[PDB]
Structures are given as C-alpha cells and as structure tokens.
Design a protein around this ligand. Structure first.
Ligand SMILES: OC[C@H]1O[C@@H](Cn2cc(-c3ccc(F)cc3)nn2)[C@H](O)[C@@H](n2cc(-c3ccccc3)nn2)[C@H]1O
Length: 139
C-alpha cells in the first residue's frame, strides 16, 4: 500500500518486525457517519493482536486490548481527550517502547499500553479497517 491516501482496508508489513523505537504515523479522517475503526499491531501467521485500538463513535470510547490465542484481554478505555469525533482529522503517533506502546494524537498524549505480547518483534502487520479515511500512513 502507498504512504499517501492509502485506501482502507490498509494492510502493511512491518519489515524486520516491530522493533523498539519504531514510530508508526497515521493521519486520517473519521467520517461524519463513521461508527468504528480499528488499528491492529498483529502477528499475521497466528492472527494474534499485540495492540488493538478501537475508536467507537457511538459512545465516544477509545478501546485498547490484545487478542492472544483467540482471547480478548482486559479493555483499557481511560483517556483525557477523544480526538476521533465524527468529521475530525487526527494526527496519531504510535511509538513501540521496551515496556509500553506510547500514543499521541495531535501532539497530545492519548494513552500508554503496557506490552502483553512481550515478544512484539513477531508483530509484522499493521492493519487499519472500518470507518476511517487515511491521508498518510508512515511505517
Ligand atoms: O476489547 C476489544 C474488542 O471488543 C470486541 C467486543 N468484545 C469484547 C469482548 C470481551 C470479552 C471478554 C473480555 F475479558 C474482554 C472483552 N468480547 N467481545 C470487538 O469485536 C473487537 N473488535 C472490533 C473490531 C473491529 C474491526 C474492524 C473495524 C472496527 C472494529 N475487531 N475486533 C475489539 O474492539
């Protein structure tokens, strides 16, 4: 998929895998009629999701979880701000740290997500699906 105006669903290969210090940029638009989209940091061969980010416009929630061997873990929903309202442009920054994913939206800290798949270098797929339009995705 291209870096600029990639269509959804976006399927991108993280070559060498998710290494520490790896920063993924997503700039995009939530349509006015959008219900939900997902960003998945996924182990393709197994289907596992180290980090799943699910903005849901219905209740204005930003749901974080992992899918590890067909099990959805505890949901993390705590935010100080929701930048994914209908008709909103967003500049999302996702850094894979040693112990935690670190996610900023429009320069403002959104959430931390402690690693659940400790072996996160096995993540080789970035996937963006659902009610989102993409202007730029940097892997
Ligand atoms: O906790 C995060 C997940 O919630 C799922 C709903 N759900 C949650 C649970 C659940 C069950 C037990 C738990 F301890 C925790 C959670 N069971 N079913 C969504 O289907 C699941 N999801 C949404 C999507 C999705 C894909 C493409 C576009 C938009 C959404 N894919 N998977 C994800 O949001």
């Amino acid at each position: 998929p291209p870096t600029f105006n990639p269509p959804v669903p976006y399927f991108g290969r993280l070559q060498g895998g998710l290494t520490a210090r790896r920063t993924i940029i997503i700039k995009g638009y939530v349509p006015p009629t959008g219900k939900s989209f997902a960003i998945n940091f996924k182990v393709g061969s197994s289907g596992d999701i180290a980090l799943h980010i699910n903005p849901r416009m219905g209740n204005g929630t930003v749901v974080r979880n992992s899918l590890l061997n067909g099990s959805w873990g505890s949901e993390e929903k705590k935010i100080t701000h929701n930048p994914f309202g209908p008709g909103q442009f967003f500049d999302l920054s996702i850094r894979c740290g040693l112990d935690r994913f670190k996610v900023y939206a429009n320069g403002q800290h959104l959430f931390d997500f402690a690693h659940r798949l400790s072996a996160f270098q096995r993540v080789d797929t970035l996937e963006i699906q659902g009610d989102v339009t993409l202007s730029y995705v940097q892997i």
